[PDB]
Amino acid sequence: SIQAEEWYFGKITRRESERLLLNAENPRGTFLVRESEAYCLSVSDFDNAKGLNVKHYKIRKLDSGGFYITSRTQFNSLQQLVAYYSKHADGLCHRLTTVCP
């Protein structure tokens, strides 16, 4: 199920996700998917005026079933959405490089 995915962290808070993502070993683009406290994608990123920071994206769910962050691309599962943005940032701050430990 989704709970067998190592990138899925359940219903954690934004503060907890930033605490998990932002340590000094996690590379730029480390990420996790969490349930909204429908899902949220949280990604670490670096910029000079901010340093290493987390961006949070809402993953919207269609009534017909698919998921999307931009209307430009939609997916039938969270697994396909994570696969796509691991290959292409395509508007996200950074490509998904590393599953958060």
Partner: peptide, 4 residues
């Protein structure tokens, strides 16, 4: 939440 960031809008892409």
């Amino acid at each position: 939440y960031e809008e892409i």
